[PDB]
């Protein structure tokens, strides 16, 4: 299984864009999918997740700004995100969690986002 990330720039402020992150490989097992961000020098925080149908969060700073959904038939979850602000910007990570008994993650490797 491998995450590969696409979408990231540089956006004005109050600007939009949206990321995907496209799944390659197979598991059969059920996963979760996130998202999160880190600015340069700081923690990697935790923004929204997919898991079953419906089954959405956000972290309270995005609410009603960014969209987390999913294309099943491409693998793929994207986050759209509307009305960037300079706290926005950051690293943009994709990840999941796999799995029942033990759980496998894997971590897509990074998209910027920069807000003017």
Same mark, same amino acid.
Do not use: F, H, M, N
């Given at each position: 299984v491998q995450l590969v990330e696409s979408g990231? #720039? /540089? @956006?004005?402020?109050?600007?939009?864009?949206?990321?995907? *992150?496209? @799944? +390659? #490989? /197979? !598991? $059969?097992? %059920? *996963? !979760? !999918?996130?998202? $999160?961000?880190?600015? %340069?020098?700081?923690?990697?925080?935790? @923004? +929204? /997740?997919? +898991? +079953? %149908?419906?089954?959405? =969060? =956000?972290?309270?700073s995005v609410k009603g700004r960014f969209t987390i959904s999913r294309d099943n038939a491409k693998n793929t979850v994207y986050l759209q995100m509307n009305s960037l602000q300079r706290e926005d910007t950051g690293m943009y990570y994709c990840q999941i969690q796999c799995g029942v008994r033990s759980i496998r993650e894997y971590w897509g490797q990074g998209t910027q986002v920069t807000v003017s």
């Open positions: 990231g #720039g /540089s @956006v004005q402020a109050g600007g939009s864009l949206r990321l995907s *992150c496209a @799944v +390659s #490989g /197979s !598991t $059969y097992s %059920p *996963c !979760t !999918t996130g998202w $999160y961000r880190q600015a %340069p020098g700081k923690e990697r925080e935790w @923004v +929204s /997740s997919i +898991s +079953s %149908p419906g089954t959405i =969060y =956000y972290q309270d």
